[model samples]
Target: HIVPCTISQLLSATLVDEVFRIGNVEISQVTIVGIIRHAEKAPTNIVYKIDDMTAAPMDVRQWVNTVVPPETYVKVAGHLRSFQNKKSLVAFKIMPLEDMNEFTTHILEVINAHMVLSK
Candidate 1:
């Protein structure tokens, strides 16, 4: 199952013994909801700087055929990555939000997950 995650939780993933785990559970993928600040639609590739208000701006590499309005809220599904000490996400799915309520729900989900995962 794709983990419903906040960016801060994703950023805080523990890596040791060559394995990555978020809190206690092992993790592969995460789906996140956030607002887009800078959207750069380029040739074949679009760059989105995602912010969940977890405060860090996440760098996402996305391909076209998807449209997300800049300064608008959206959700992203991606792979966690680190290359040359740079943290970025490879977005496989990206979509704009229809209900602002989803944004609020996402925040509640974040809080819910935090408590469940905190142990």
Candidate 2:
């Protein structure tokens, strides 16, 4: 069962102990979800939120925003972690990107703009 969730919920949830395992043995795993958020500017790193139809959130960090055109459809897989202050997901394994619809692109652009300007 693929758990669909949102990046915001991951940020809003309480931290828990996360263990990444494959089958029975503890091995690294990956998560593939849609990108619900992206950052703007020099840092070059962005947080993506994966969500189910309900729009629950799971936060994931990507190393390369690498020309990810806002609200662009993507597939990402990474380790899962729950730190003392945050409960989120991150995939260093593979992050692929694609362009989104014109409306979504515009909306995402707006979000990026606001985030950069916000305090």
Candidate 3:
């Protein structure tokens, strides 16, 4: 079975825990914004940990070899399912948040510039 709901209500326990684990949910079409909680490389693939406004953690595992470096803002649309470790929302598809690249660059520059001037 598949279920649908607004983003505001998406994280409800009854909805997320039950629906995501028991049935297929269409998350790829939903517009969501969140942050990359962290990224870790497993023996076979990379895992992305994301946290949304609901403050709930969503784990996304992908076969892509490319890196989703830390602090990178990502907008994803994908399916929600439970694999083995946790009941996670795996994002098969994603798009970087607007200004994500530029914002990261600026943050790095400011940090570096401050360090250089100080020392």
Candidate 4:
């Protein structure tokens, strides 16, 4: 049986620079919360630039267009990947955050995970 992991789990487990590494390596499951800085539409996918406020911003890609606007706070669950040195997230799901506290809560979760792992 497989149990799915959340964003907080992965973010705390891996280094921020790992995602932006120079080559394509399938990243473990991750859930990311951030603000959409911009979006680009394509024939089969939409690329959204997100800033989680921890390290350089990254891109999240989904195959369909949704109603999310720029600067909207959202949660994206997916795998981190890169193609030809360009980094991006192949999103499984993207949704809006109903609670403002979720952001800080996620940060705390990251810290907690780090502490546990460091021991």
Q: By lDDT, who's the top model here?
A: 1
Task: Tell me how far the alpha carbon of residue 100 in candidate 4 is from the true structure, in angstroms, after superposition.
Answer: 0.8
Number of the top candidate by TM-score?
1
* Tens digits of per-residue lDDT for model 3, 1-119: 22322233344323454453212322322334457778888777677776555556566666543666766677655565544534555566656667766445534553453344332
Query: For candidate 4, lDDT tens digit of each residue in 1-119?
Result: 11133333333343346543112333455677888889888888888887887656687888863647899998888776656645567887888799979877876765664454442
On a 0 to 1 TM-score scale, where does candidate 3 land against the true structure?
Answer: 0.53
Against the correct fold, how does model 4 do in TM-score? Answer: 0.70
Question: What are the runs in model 3 whose C-alpha is more than 4 Å off?
Answer: 1-31, 83-86, 100-119
RMSD of 2: 12.2
Model 4, position 112, has a per-residue lDDT of: 61
Q: How many backbone collisions does model 1 have?
A: 0
Alpha carbon lDDT at 77, candidate 2: 55
Rank order by lDDT, top first?
1, 4, 3, 2
lDDT of 3 at 66: 68
**What TM-score, computed on C-alpha atoms, does each candidate reach?**
0.82, 0.45, 0.53, 0.70
RMSD of 4: 5.8
Model 3 has a clash total of 2
**Which segments of candidate 1 are over 4 A away from where they belong?**
64-67
Q: Which RMSD values do the candidates have, in order?
A: 2.2, 12.2, 13.5, 5.8
